[model samples]
Target: EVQLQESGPSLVKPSQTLSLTCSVTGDSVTSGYWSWIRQFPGNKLDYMGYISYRGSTYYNPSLKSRISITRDTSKNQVYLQLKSVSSEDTATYYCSYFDSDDYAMEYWGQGTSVTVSSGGGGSQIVLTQSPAIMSASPGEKVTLTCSASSSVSSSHLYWYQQKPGSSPKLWIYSTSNLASGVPARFSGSGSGTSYSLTISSMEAEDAASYFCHQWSSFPFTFGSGTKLEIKR
Candidate 1:
């Protein structure tokens, strides 16, 4: 029954700090880990980082120097502060509960749009995904692929599933490792810039968008995403 709501300014000036707040209800901020994620215009998702209930924090290596995740236990709210942002930083920012027991993102905020105007620019790595759209019948096997601009370690790759009107959820972590509670039918495999997510049997609920992300280098990148439709 946990709920998260994100609030912040939609517009931010260049060379300034962008701040956002995630108010929590039905749960205590000090009882679990929380994370920040953002999605670009092209449906590219990025995991900014996470802050543990005990106050420990971890950030995307690319954003480590410019990002901060903190909370006010008394308010039961968490905050995100990004310094010196640019237009490239413009995106829809979201906050979610990182279920330690499941080792995956669960409850999520609706998200807040942040645009940095009159700003500078940004990335070294690009992720390419094939079969931008696909369809399959129930019980049919499905495979989605992602290729990086350059070599990337399997351990640095991850996958997410996002349904319409809902925030993205972590499905595969560290390449081929499935998140807790995820179905065994869902699997990931690959190495050195090439990776794929496969479904042993596509289900009606599996119809959604899937994206791949690589964090081995600076400016962590995400694939454009592949849309999967359930064939009636």
Candidate 2:
């Protein structure tokens, strides 16, 4: 019954500060750690950063200098502040709950998209970033792969299913084990630089975006997501 919601301005002018808030409901924010991860418009990099419940935060090394996450535990909310925002900073930002004991994000918010425009009143540079898309027929099997520049342990890789307009759900953890309530058709595989999230039998609802996250590395990384569509 735990839920998390992200709220923030959807538009920001270049060089302005982008702020966002995550509200925790049906659960205590103090009970577990939370993170702010984003999917920027560029397909080149998908996963972003994370902040811990201990008041410590970690960001994508690329964004380290401009990003920070803080909280008001008493209010059950987490805040994200990104300064000097730019067009490249545009993306769907999400607030997630991570269960430290399991080393995974158990819950997530629907995400809020923030766009950076030219505050100087010039032409806006438009970016069209989309998740990698794939197709498969029902009863057919498909493997969605996530590869990283560095080696990743099987235990460190996790997979998530994100449907349109809904918070993502953790479906694969510790590489192959399904999270609670995940369908039996879903499974994960791979290690050390290459990993795959597999579906034994594709279903109608299985048609959604999938993402991979690894906590083994210091700055933590997420695979660019894959969008699944039913071909027949």
Candidate 3:
């Protein structure tokens, strides 16, 4: 079993830099595309950037100026850096890998989180920012969706269940939620936005994976997802 683990400071102050490392075990393996993706609270998951054995890279255009990824084939680790960050950039940061040809993140890191306070952008650049609470009127129902570049329409959609421990929870069967205990407000509808999974409520427990699925693509791809912004 290949295991992915993340190591870094669990906490960070506002406006400071943060850094984290992902160590892989079990597969000494062939090279694939290694990436750094993040899920900021209340906002959708975003792909920060990625590095392949050849060092070819691709990053979210929005985060390009502020981010970078490097790797050590010798140590079997991938590194991440984000510059000019603020409190708005906090969230659960994860390192995952998949075939460079396949867009899906087949394997994911356990995830490490870093906060942004009033500290300087020190030797470390925060890997993940704290999730932001979506600014919605309480009781207002909404769904955050993500999809891949060329997959979504008519393709199979998947919803993963994420809990506090033991891997993310696989909630809805395929893409639709189960009728049992399913919130009337919880529903999903979309195509190829990458983060195509939807949430019917701003509820507390509803705040998990909410990820989209697409078996159409030879490999696979997930939208930058929203961790949900639940207000008690």
lDDT of each: 0.84, 0.74, 0.58
Candidate 2 or 1, higher lDDT: 1
Per-residue lDDT tens digits for candidate 2, residues 1-232, read 5688999899899999999999888955454567787776643234455667677766656666777788887888889998898888888888878767756448778788888872212111111213388889998998888877667677977877877676668888888988887888888888777778788998888998887877776556666678789985
After TM-score superposition, the amount by which residue 127's alpha carbon in candidate 1 deviates from its true location, in angstroms, is 6.4
Scanning candidate 1 in windows of ten residues, the lowest lDDT window is 118-127
Global lDDT of model 1 = 0.84
lDDT of 1 at 72: 93
Model 1 ranges off by over 4 Å: 28-32, 118-128, 135-140, 146-158, 172-195, 200-205, 213-223, 230-232
User: Which has the higher lDDT value, candidate number 1 or candidate number 3?
Assistant: 1
Model 1 Cα lDDT, one tens digit per residue, 1-232: 6888999999999989999999988943336678898988777788788888888887777787888999897888899999989999999999988555554446778888899982323445788888999989999999999989899888878888888777777789878899866889999999987899999988898899998987687555678899999875
Query: How high a TM-score does candidate 1 get?
Result: 0.71
Roughly what TM-score does model 3 have, to 2 decimal places? 0.58
Per-candidate TM-score against the hidden true structure? 0.71, 0.84, 0.58
- Which is the better candidate, 1 or 2, if ranked by TM-score? 2
Rank ordering of all candidates by lDDT, starting from the highest: 1, 2, 3
